[PDB]
Ligand binder design. Structure first.
Ligand SMILES: *[C@@H]1O[C@H](CO)[C@@H](O[C@@H]2O[C@H](CO)[C@@H](O[C@@H]3O[C@H](CO)[C@@H](O)[C@H](O)[C@@H]3O)[C@H](O)[C@H]2NC(C)=O)[C@H](O)[C@H]1NC(C)=O
Ligand SMILES: *[C@@H]1O[C@H](CO)[C@@H](O[C@@H]2O[C@H](CO)[C@@H](O[C@@H]3O[C@H](CO)[C@@H](O)[C@H](O)[C@@H]3O)[C@H](O)[C@H]2NC(C)=O)[C@H](O)[C@H]1NC(C)=O
Lengths: 50, 50
């Protein structure tokens, strides 16, 4: 659904005459608390590494 | 319908309280192959002229 102050990602299909499947609205703000990691961590007491 | 990566031309009417009749979505890329000429050519073996 539409969120205030959000950007949109439009998902399309070409079935073989394309259609729009859905519109994903992303509402977000910047900072450190939430991180989009590629996967869950396992056996991890401290997520950070280097 | 909506096309991915397309521009829109909105067609409106004022009937005498206006309405939008339709939205035309244009999906295109640049180059030489397809040309929007004003009309068909007749008796033409070579479309180009100068
Ligand atoms: C930032 O500094 C902290 C503190 O030194 C680093 O955390 C330390 O990370 C090491 C390596 O994972 C931990 O050692 C581990 O201890 C556990 C038992 O608790 C053991 O099972 C593992 O084999 C390993 O020896 C250490 O506990 C941990 N120290 C603390 C107090 O957090 C951290 O790694 C640094 N940041 C980054 C980028 O990793
Ligand atoms: C780019 O150069 C080509 C090649 O010279 C030009 O094409 C030539 O155009 C002339 C004029 O239309 C053609 O002459 C015509 O011949 C037909 C019979 O085939 C005849 O019925 C007409 O009365 C006229 O005499 C000629 O055939 C044609 N040559 C070839 C091989 O394409 C062309 O005009 C040039 N590009 C542009 C911008 O026109």
């Amino acid at each position: 659904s539409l969120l205030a102050s959000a950007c949109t990602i439009d998902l399309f299909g070409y079935p073989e005459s394309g259609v729009k499947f859905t519109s994903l609205y992303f509402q977000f703000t910047k900072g450190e608390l939430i991180t989009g990691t590629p996967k869950p961590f396992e056996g991890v007491t401290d997520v950070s590494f280097m």
